[PDB]
Write a protein that binds this ligand. Structure first.
Ligand code: NI
Ligand code: NI
Ligand code: NI
Ligand code: NI
Length: 235
């Protein structure tokens, strides 16, 4: 008939059965929010501001939405005053190990900085940023070159051009650069590190978005997966 998932998923705790009740409840909350957002989008076909003004009623910290068709990446983007505000908090401001997909506290929304950074968990249960790992394969990249990114000030597409693995020590990412030479070096370095080949033209006149896995404090994880994309304005 008309099914969004392999199996039917109950949303009310009282009807959720089986193992991992909590995980299923967390999943239910995202499914509910995805539905609310999808209806908002289909309704405001000519704009994007109303969609987010509606989401802000839930939490003013919801500053965007990121979605990749055919994958589990379909979540609200949170932003706090630090890069750990939403590390272990969901969009309802409830404590959750996986937290939220969140934007670096330094980034602007109305007029994007040179490099906009989003962070998310990668626990390997096919949620949040687990999808970034799939980008390390050329086959997957080719079929998922465009990611949707929306915010109150516009609708964008992220044209993926680099995916690689690094350490968890690499904790300082620049949002803007001293000059074109440094930005050019960053772009060149980004393509150089990529384990996948891309034909995307990115120049110093362009803006990019960095998607990075992020781990819990005092975690054993040693590697991070990074995916970088060129930001394209849709409407
Ligand atoms: Ni079933
Ligand atoms: Ni269920
Ligand atoms: Ni049932
Ligand atoms: Ni608390």
């Amino acid at each position: 008939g008309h099914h969004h998932h392999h199996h039917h998923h109950h949303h009310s705790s009282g009807h959720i059965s089986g193992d991992a009740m909590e995980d299923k409840q967390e999943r239910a909350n995202y499914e509910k929010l995805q539905q609310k957002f999808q209806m908002l989008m289909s309704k405001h076909q000519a704009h994007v501001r109303p969609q987010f003004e509606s989401l802000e009623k839930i939490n003013k910290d919801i500053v965007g939405w990121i979605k990749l068709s055919g994958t589990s990446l379909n979540y609200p983007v949170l932003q706090g005053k630090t890069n750990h505000d939403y590390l272990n908090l969901d969009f309802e401001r409830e404590h959750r190990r996986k937290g939220s997909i969140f934007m670096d506290f330094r980034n602007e929304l109305k007029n994007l900085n040179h490099n906009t950074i989003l962070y998310g968990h990668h626990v390997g249960d096919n949620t949040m940023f687990d999808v970034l790992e799939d980008y390390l394969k050329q086959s997957f990249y080719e079929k998922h070159k465009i990611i949707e990114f929306d915010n109150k000030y516009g609708k964008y597409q992220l044209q993926v051009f680099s995916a690689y693995k690094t350490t968890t020590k690499d904790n300082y990412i620049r949002t803007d650069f001293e000059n074109d030479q440094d930005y050019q070096q960053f772009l060149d370095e980004t393509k150089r590190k990529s384990v996948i080949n891309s034909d995307v033209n990115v120049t110093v006149k362009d803006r990019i978005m960095t998607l990075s896995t992020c781990e819990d404090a005092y975690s054993e994880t040693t590697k991070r997966i990074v995916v970088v994309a060129k930001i394209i304005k849709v409407s």
